[PDB]
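quick one, two chains, predict together pls
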Amino acid sequence: KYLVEFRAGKMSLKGTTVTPDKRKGLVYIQQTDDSLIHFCWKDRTSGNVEDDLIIFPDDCEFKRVPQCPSGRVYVLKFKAGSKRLFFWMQEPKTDQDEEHCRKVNEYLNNPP
Amino acid sequence: GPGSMTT
């Protein structure tokens, strides 16, 4: 039921300022027993699930934010309200970053 | 510090 998983931190908004959260994290996509698809973020130290968003095809895109040199930053963009959530890849190698991005989009928008 | 996304 865990379709996609990868190490990544999240970010926080205070006022109008986006600040990366340094917590070790895991982004994952889980299909639940009702067949719904959840985009989740959990704290890898505590096991605390902080983000849990039910996403249907065409609701979202997940994309690299290429202009940031200080991390491998990705954005989960919602059509609804132009809402954005930022994540930053935490695997020590970058080899699988684009693959993880591809699989997020696949399972949210065009699953097997 | 060491950077926003650095430990």
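The interface with chain A takes residues 3-7 of chain B (CB under 8 Å).
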